[PDB]
Design a protein around this ligand. Structure first.
Ligand SMILES: NC(=[NH2+])NCCC[C@H]1O[C@@H](n2cnc3c(N)ncnc32)[C@H](O)[C@@H]1O
Ligand SMILES: NC(=[NH2+])NCCC[C@H]1O[C@@H](n2cnc3c(N)ncnc32)[C@H](O)[C@@H]1O
Lengths: 325, 336
């Protein structure tokens, strides 16, 4: 745990998260749009960082915010709260949320806990521990749920990198087309999850929701250990080389506001989690693709995301690939 | 990591496509070698060439296209098998010979007329590949032979880094967009972003340059005894006067290499300066612990030494000694 917390003692990660305008505006609005449910109520900010989300909760009308932060950045949060004149009702409490002592259970929890592929970092378990210990019955969760999506992809950037070697002749007068098979093995033949941003034109079929996480659900923490995911089925839009699948998520706040990391929506720092096949597979309009995706903690490191992929393209035999972040 | 582990990582890196894609996609770099080689056709026609660390073989092929009779393309990582295919694909395997393994233990049939190599790393000497080129020169280059490029030059300039300024000022600008005052974090951000002792590789522009760049070292690859200068430290002293008022953030170090042949007084130069087109080498930034205000005609002097790290000969270390105006001389010790 200590190694993890120390990653957040440096300014850069916090600058990156606030500079993610889609992320930060969405949390801001998700909180402020809940003013009626927060007015005069108490809030626990799990992993409060610099404190910015706790101050949004105060602007929404919370009577008190407990801002709990395990890394050294809590000292900066204390100063931010003081600078904004909110030390009377926003209280920064250092340490893990699992052992912090609050004066009272709270009406609401706010937290930005999502990692790459949703569950990389595994910070959800700390939010669920706080829910069990400190959230009043039926309390407000900001956000309250996460939804997981998959779509087959033809990655235009990958195509360009594989095709790069056949363009060397035009650039420098040396033919290097024979490098394409080697490049394919290098860029696709591995078993790592690739975090990369796609565009709408990389999506080869209607995205499918394959799992939903309800943060209030008691027993969710046990589900995370066993893996979360599910089956999916789709049919391709048209002819292209299938490179694999993109996985992304959205979270929904108590119309409810949705923060999405879909390639069809404005870019975020999460991008998408790309699962490449070992080599491209030609697909056509109406080619059926079915499969199953499971998000699991790595055996060597619970905080490291693993994804089991099972898939069937058209008539081909079912195949499997086991990815890790 | 142990030496065994460092060697394995190096092998894995250059056995993989990504680094070679980056180098070849670096058009300034690759065009400079193509033209610099072709401009030496008169010295290369009918002669033999050793390409130290040939990679995919593209530079060896440039040498064949310039008229070389025979090219030995020596490559230690698994990419040598890709280079063999590339050479065959272009119909050149009967005089471009891809040879696997370290140049330090390869066997050639004779000493060669010329050596070509793209050996430069970040801050010129990060990765420390020059030593292999010099080993090949001593062992395989004929007396009075040709080196391509023939020399490298190191430059320094004081900088006011506009990107760093933006990152340091980020916290003071949060409130005007999100309604939360975070100005109090500027000191913390400064400690995090400047108080470290890491060399930062980043692209600068001419706007960031606070004074006329100063050349502070030159490496003549033909010089016997250059290998001994590498271990003792490469560098030199500098002085400059600031263009105007701005916060001094530290210094940028960059290099160029010069190809022989052509105009004896205007050789072909591959530059990584912020004043010239971008390359994958960017520049090596040496940040002071905190910004220092300077004015027009503020004098800045000091000394810069590039050394291999004691824990890892492939890891660049830079010792900076510097004096700003009337302030006392200061020192800072950076590592890549
Ligand atoms: N969205 C993410 N991928 N990560 C969000 C991390 C936000 C903050 O939560 C802090 N943090 C993480 N786990 C804990 C914990 N159990 N208790 C308290 N603070 C924590 C961490 O130090 C950081 O400052
Ligand atoms: N400009 C740089 N910063 N590095 C250029 C490295 C180019 C190629 O030289 C190869 N290489 C490195 N050292 C050696 C050596 N001693 N002998 C042979 N090949 C080598 C390495 O495997 C790579 O494929």
């Amino acid at each position: 745990d200590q190694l993890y917390y120390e990653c957040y003692s440096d300014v850069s990660v916090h600058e990156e998260m606030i500079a993610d305008q889609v992320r930060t505006e969405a949390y801001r609005l998700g909180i402020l749009k809940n003013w009626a449910a927060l007015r005069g109520k108490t809030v626990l900010d799990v992993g409060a960082g610099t404190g910015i989300l706790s101050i949004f909760c105060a602007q929404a009308g919370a009577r008190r915010v407990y801002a709990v932060e395990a890394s050294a950045i809590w000292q900066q949060a204390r100063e931010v709260v003081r600078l904004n004149g909110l030390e009377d009702r926003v209280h920064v409490l250092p340490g893990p949320v699992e052992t912090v002592e609050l004066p009272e259970r709270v009406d609401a929890i706010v937290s930005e806990w999502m990692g790459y592929g949703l569950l990389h970092e595994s910070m959800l378990s700390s939010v669920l521990h706080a829910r069990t210990k400190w959230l009043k019955e039926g309390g407000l969760l900001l956000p309250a749920s996460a939804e997981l999506f998959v779509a087959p992809i033809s990655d235009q950037m990958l195509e360009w990198r594989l095709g790069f070697w056949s363009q060397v002749k035009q650039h420098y007068g040396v033919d290097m087309s024979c490098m394409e098979s080697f490049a394919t093995r290098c860029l696709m033949g591995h078993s790592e999850i690739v975090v990369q941003d796609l565009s709408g034109e990389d999506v080869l079929a209607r995205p499918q929701r394959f799992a939903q996480l309800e943060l209030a659900r008691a027993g969710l923490e046990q589900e995370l250990e066993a893996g979360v995911g599910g089956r999916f089925r789709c049919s391709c839009y048209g002819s292209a080389p299938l490179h694999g699948f993109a996985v992304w998520f959205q979270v929904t706040f108590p119309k409810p506001l949705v923060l999405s990391t879909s390639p069809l929506h404005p870019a975020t720092h999460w991008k998408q989690a790309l699962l490449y096949l070992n080599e491209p597979v030609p697909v056509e309009q109406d080619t059926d693709i079915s499969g199953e995706i499971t998000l699991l903690p790595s055996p060597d490191n619970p905080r490291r995301l693993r994804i089991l992929l099972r898939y069937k393209v058209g008539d081909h035999e079912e195949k499997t690939k086991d990815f890790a972040m």
